[PDB]
Every structure is written in C-alpha cells, then in structure tokens.
Amino acid sequence: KAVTDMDINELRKLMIGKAIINSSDMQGDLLQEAQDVIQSGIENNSAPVLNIEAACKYIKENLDKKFGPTWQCIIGEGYAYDVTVQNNTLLFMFYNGNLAVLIFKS
Amino acid sequence: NADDQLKQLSALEGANGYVIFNESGIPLKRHEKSISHEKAVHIAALVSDLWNVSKKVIQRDLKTPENDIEVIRLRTKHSYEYIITQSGDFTMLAIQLCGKAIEEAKKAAAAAAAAAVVQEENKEKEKK
Amino acid sequence: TERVKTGDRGMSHKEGGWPGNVDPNEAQETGRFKKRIEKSFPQAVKDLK
Amino acid sequence: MASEVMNLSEEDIQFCQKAFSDYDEDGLGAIKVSDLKLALENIGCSLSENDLFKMISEVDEKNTGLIKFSDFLNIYYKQKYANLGDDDQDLVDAFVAMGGNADTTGSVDANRLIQIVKEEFEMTIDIVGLIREIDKDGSGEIEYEEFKLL
Amino acid sequence: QQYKTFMGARVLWPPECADDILEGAIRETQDALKKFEIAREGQKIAEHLKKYMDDHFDPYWHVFFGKNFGCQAVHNKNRFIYFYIEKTAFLMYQT
Amino acid sequence: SHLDKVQPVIKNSDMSVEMQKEVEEVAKKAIDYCNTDKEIATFIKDDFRSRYHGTWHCIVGRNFGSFVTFERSYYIYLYVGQLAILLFKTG
Amino acid sequence: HANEQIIDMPENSEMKSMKNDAFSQAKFAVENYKFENKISSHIKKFFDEKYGPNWHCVVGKHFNAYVSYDSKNFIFFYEGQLAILLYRKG
C-alpha cells in the first residue's frame, strides 16, 4: 500500500487540486495573490477539454489589470525558453500532471 | 498489404505496440492498444529529438567520419523495451515486454474475461 | 517619447507539428494527408517492421 | 599607432588567445554569438547576462560587425580579484609564530604558559617542543608542526 | 506629432525652438554624447548640456532627456526644442 | 540533405518577409548546432539580440500555450518537427 | 518601491501640505489616467490652482534631467513603478 500501491496514473487521478511550485523569484506576498487567481481561472476556463489559448487569455487579462500593463504568461506541456525579466517580476509554478505554467512581468 | 504488417507486429510475442514517424514528425500508423494520435504526437516528438541528437552526436561528438546509428534500444523499469529502427525517411518505435510482463498481461486479460463473464451472469440473473 | 506598441496574443502549441495547408483540429484534413503519405510507404513499413 | 605604452601582457595576450579561438574562422567579422562562444566553451560565466552586462555597459551593440572584439578586451578587466581561505592548522601555527612565521621558539611556549591550566605545565611543554622538533634545531617549523599535529 | 530628421538628429519637423539655437543645441548634444555615453554616467552629460545652454543662450534653461518619458511644460516663445538621437529623446525648454 | 528534410513551416508570422526568411535559416542552424532543446532557446535569443537590439523572450517546447505582449511586427511563429521557435520582443 | 527619494519642501511653515498634496495627487492621477503625458498635465494643473503658476512637472518611467528650480519648491518621489518629478521655476 502507500507509495508502492500508488501509480503515476493513480496519483494524477487521486489528486487534481495538488499545487507544486518549482521556481520562485517574485515576492511571497505577490505570489499568494497570483497563485489563487491562476488556479481559480484555469479551472473555470478548463471546460470539457482544457484549452491552452483559453487559459492564457483569462490569465493575461486578469494580470494586466492586477499589476502592470505588459504582463506575459505562457503555459505548455513541455518547453525550453530564455526570458529577460525585471527583478521580482517572474513566478514559475507547474500544476499536478503535465501542466507547466510560466508568468513574468515585462 | 500495409495493414498486414501491423497485424504481424502484434502477432510477434512480447510486442505491445508499433508507432511509425515521418520526417516531418506526423505519426503514420500506431497500435490500437496504445493511445492513437495523442500518444503518437507525444512519442514522435521525443524520438525525433533523441534520434536527431544521437545521429548528430555520433558524427561529431565521437569524432568518427561516416558513422550512422542503425538501431537504438532503451531498456527501462519493468518490461518496457523501445527498439527504434529508421527505414528511408520513416522511423518507428516498438514497445515489447519480457516473459514475466507477458505473463502478467495474460493474467490481466484472463481476469478481465472473468469479470465480463460475471457481469453477464449477473445480467442473466436480473433478467430471470 | 513614443511608446512601442504592445500587442497581446494567446496561442496553443499543444497540437503536434503539421503542414500549414493541413488543419490539426480537423479530422478530414489529417486523414487525407496520412493516406497521401502511404502512396514508397508500403515497402518501408514491412521492411521496418 | 602606439605611443610609449607598456601595459600588461598577460591579459593582452589572453584576449588574443580566446579571440582567435572562435575567430579562427577568419571571417574578419564578429557577431554577438561568437563573443559568448568562448565563455560558453570554457564556461567562464554562468549566463550570457554577465558578459552582456559589462558589454552593454560599454555603450551599445548590434547584430554583427567586428567591434564585438571589445567583449574580450574588457572581459579580461572584469576578472577582478580572488580571494579565499583554506585550512585552520596554518592559523594555529601563526598564533604561536609571532614573528609572523614558523621560526623562533620557547617564547611561544611561554605565551601558552601564561594562564595555562594544562597538565605537565612546563615539563610537558618542553617534551612537546622536543617531539615537534625532528631535526634537532630547537624549533618546530611548519612541516614538523603539520607532521606533529597529523 | 510628425517627427523630422535634421542634421542627423530626429526632432519635431515644425521646430518650437529658433532655427539658429536649435541647430547649435543639437550639435552640442551630439558632441557631448560622442564623448560621454548616455548609458554610463548619464547624469553628468545632461548637467554639462544645461551649463552650456546658459553660456550661449538666455539663462534658466531646463533640460530633461530619457529613453522613455512623457511631459507637458510652459515655455517662452521659440524656447522649446525636442529631438530624438538614436533611441534617446532630448527635450529642453528655456524659462 | 537534413536541411531539405526538416522543411520548417511558420504557422503564424507577424514580421517582414525578408526578416522571416533569415529566421528560418537561423532556426535550422540552431537545431543542428544545439545538442539539447534548452541550448536551442538560448542560441536563438543570443543571435536575435546581436542582430536586433532589444529584449527578446524565446520559449520552445513539444506542447505549450502562450499569450504574450510583444512589440508589433516583432513576433514570428514557426514550427519545425515537435519544436516551436517563438520570439517576441517586448519594450 | 521608492526606496530613495529627494525631498526639498518647507516644514511647519504652513506650506507642509505641498509635500502631502504631491504624494496624494500623484497616486490618484497615475492610476486613473494611465498615460505618461496625461500624468504631467494633471499634476501641473492641480498644483497650479493651489500654489499659483510657473510649475513644471515631467513624468517618465526612465529618464535623466538637470534643471534649475526655486528653493523649497522641488520634490522628487516615486509613485509605484512610475517616477514623477515636479518643481516650480519663476
């Protein structure tokens, strides 16, 4: 039982609300506001089949009003990127399963 | 004719599925047991990155002129095996399992059949 | 001072690489394209298999 | 056209080394990628941000021409200084070697004796000096000290 | 809003400042940049330009130059000069 | 003959055709030169930054969704194999 | 976060409100207008009615400037990300 009983397919099915943060470069108080908004927005726009474009459009509009005029966030199953951002303007957190989310302020 | 090869691959013992990749990366044909298209799109991208990197690395990184990789076999945990063979512009991935894995699969199939039989019996009882 | 224009565009790269003429979402475009590739294709698959 | 300017050679040479290294192509021009090639080959800096920082500070930049060489010319000047500290034995030796060296003696033993509650108050100290003195010159040099302590 | 290029410098095509003074100011700014770069010790070059304006023009000149900025000010007739050199815009109004 | 084989295709392009042609050659050169995908992203950003001054953000992945705020006519989207070369300059 | 600002205004001379008004006006004007050119016009107009004319204010995210101002009439502060400079000359 426990970890041995658990399987990758089983783990994904068992928990869909688990939140994992891989890279943090933004102030913690700012991260708390951003994390609550992104999780709520993705679930609302997830629909029958998750849309990468749909999730980004909702996140981009919310972030621009929330902090600064030019805010760029990209979410993909797998990607390699080099990004130049302002100090404490980049937060990297990936959702449980094959979902990687990158949000930064330019 | 082309359809028979897919049936032949399934016939070989220890074979789970076969995936074929074009130079572009589109998956021509994939096995029905394994996910079709969604898995093929995900498998084709990984194999092309691996096959291209390995082909490029052998020629320059090993400093050997006119040396080309012919077959790549990756043995992982449990029964997974992923032989990769490239013919002309098409490269395919074959997933085969070990004897123990095959036995386990057979047992699982038998269990599924038993479950189906039990369900049928229950339905008959309900009808009665 | 002139402010460089900022345009917000959202796109999804989840779909696998495909030719521009073909449409990944449409089943008909993908099905016709796969049939065209196997028209050659027959010899390679038996040999590859 | 020089005009009586000695200047350092160690660095002046380094630049030429790394320069011709990637510029070996003999294209006659330099790009923004080549400048990073060197640091990317040896791994001088962690990210291009470093080299780009200093370079960018120089004035400006573009796509590719030849002036890019400045990256190396200035790169050598951003190396700055190193310094780190290794071992804790050497310090102990220096605590006893007041002439700021291994050499001289008994005076350091007497310094230990001031407010010393250690066993064999002075006979033990003399015995320790003799044990630490392998070549019989009445002193413990750094090599003897290390052998004694290890 | 229609920018124009004169003497190698981009400035408003209709010049608020006098044609004589505007040309001299643009030449002085270009010479100052040739010597001191905007990116490093940028504060020093702006101060030098302000002192130079007082020597050859009416005193209390105001000089503001930044890569990106927006401003509205009240200036004397023919005492406002706005121009862009490379990616940097220099705006000076005499009070 | 590998260059002929890749046949990189730009699904969405918002740049001058002459500039776009240059990007295709750089994209093909970057893939062969870089051993890993992470290296490819760094190489594309460095080459473009040297060629055109500004801040360039490049992300390449097998599967991803992107919404960005880029300078108009500075965003070119091209897909080769399973890799997406996306560059958007933001001021 | 406006870590360093330059303050040159009179204290307890009944002109203490000028410093307070500049901070309050900049925060209200910057959020509603959301334009660099508009912020300078709005800040200058409010200050002009309260303390008379000849006030020049320039707002830029990043800029370098040197100017001559009347003593105790120049205040430099950062409103959020934006930097606003306002002074009185003449």
Q: G18: Cβ–Cβ under 8 A, 6 or more apart, which residues?
A: G9, G10, G47, G50, G51, G73, G75
How far is residue B23's CA from residue E65's CA, in Å, rounded to a whole number? Answer: 55
How far is residue B123's CA from residue B26's CA, in Å, rounded to a whole number? Answer: 44
Got the DSSP string for D82-129?
Answer: ------SHHHHHHHH-TTTSS---THHHHHHHTT---SSTTHHHHHHH
C1 touches chain E (CB under 8 A): yes
User: How many other β-carbons are positioned within 10 Å of the β-carbon of residue G68?
Assistant: 16
Q: Tokens at residue A43, please? A: 């679930």
Sheet order of strands, G6-8 included: E3-6, E9-12, E80-85, E88-94, E61-72, G55-66, G82-88, G74-79, G6-8
Helix A28-46 vs helix A52-66: crossing angle, to nearest 10: 140
Which residues in chain E have Cβ-Cβ distances shorter than 8 Å to G39? 70
Q: Using CB atoms within 10 Å of the CB of residue B110, give its burial: 0 to 12 exposed, 13 to 18 middle, 19+ buried.
A: exposed
Tell me, rounded to whole angstroms, the distance of Cα B95 from its chain centroid.
3
Which residues in chain E have Cβ-Cβ distances shorter than 8 Å to G65? 46, 62-66
The neighbouring-strand residues paired with G86 are G57, G75
The DSSP H or E segment spanning G33 is: helix G16-33
C37 touches chain F (CB under 8 A): no
Local structure of residue B103 (DSSP, 8 states):
H
Q: Tokens at residue E27, please? A: 């030449």
CA distances in angstroms from A12 to A16, A96, D101, D134, G16, listed in the order given: 6, 7, 66, 70, 62
Nearest Cα to A20, choosing from A87, A100, A103? A100
Nearest chain C residue (CA) to A106: C6
Which residues in chain B have Cβ-Cβ distances shorter than 8 Å to C13? none
Return the CA Rg of chain D. Answer: 28
According to the entry, how was the structure determined?
Answer: cryo-EM
Q: Using CB atoms within 10 Å of the CB of residue B98, give its burial: 0 to 12 exposed, 13 to 18 middle, 19+ buried.
A: middle
Half-sphere exposure for A61 (CA within 13 Å, toward CB): 8
- Please tell me the distance in Å from C46's CA to the nearest CA on chain F: 22
CB contact under 8 A, F65 and C10: yes
Q: C35: Cβ–Cβ under 8 A, 6 or more apart, which residues?
A: none
Q: Hey, what long-range contacts does A20-24 have (CB within 8 A, 24 or more apart)?
A: A20/A93, A20/A94, A20/A95, A20/A96, A21/A92, A21/A93, A22/A92, A22/A93, A22/A94, A23/A90, A23/A91, A23/A92, A23/A93, A24/A91, A24/A92
CB contact under 8 A, F7 and B25: no
Sheet order of strands, B15-21 included: B27-30, B15-21, B90-96, B82-87, B71-72
Nearest Cα to F5, choosing from F65, F57, F80? F80
Nearest Cα to F20, choosing from F87, F90, F91? F87
Nearest Cα to E25, choosing from E40, E43, E7, E37? E7
How far is residue C37's CA from residue B36's CA, in Å, rounded to a whole number? Answer: 18
E47 touches chain D (CB under 8 A): no
CA distances in angstroms from C4 to E50, E87, F91, listed in the order given: 29, 11, 6
User: How many other β-carbons are positioned within 10 Å of the β-carbon of residue A12?
Assistant: 13
How far is residue F38's CA from residue F49's CA, in Å, rounded to a whole number? Answer: 17
How far is residue D54's CA from residue F20's CA, in Å, rounded to a whole number? Answer: 31
Of F7, F32, F82, the CB nearest to B48: F82
How far is residue G29's CA from residue B69's CA, in Å, rounded to a whole number? Answer: 67
CA distances in angstroms from B68 to B63, C49, D110, E31, E48, listed in the order given: 12, 20, 77, 61, 66
Which residues in chain F have Cβ-Cβ distances shorter than 8 Å to D32? 46-47, 49-51
φ, ψ (nearest 5 deg) of residue C19:
-65, 150
The DSSP H or E segment spanning A10 is: helix A8-14
CA distances in angstroms from B25 to B28, F51, G22, listed in the order given: 9, 31, 62
Max Cα–Cα distance, chain A, nearest Å: 50
Which residues in chain D have Cβ-Cβ distances shorter than 8 Å to E86? 60
Sign of the Cα pseudo-torsion (D130, D134, D139, D141, in order): negative
Q: Tokens at residue E36, please? A: 């001191």
Max Cα–Cα distance, chain D, nearest Å: 78
Q: Using CB atoms within 10 Å of the CB of residue B78, give its burial: 0 to 12 exposed, 13 to 18 middle, 19+ buried.
A: exposed
CA distances in angstroms from F66 to A32, A74, F14, G22, listed in the order given: 22, 4, 15, 40
For chain C, the helix, strand and coil percentages under 3-state DSSP, each to the nearest 5: 40, 15, 45
Resolution in A: 4.5
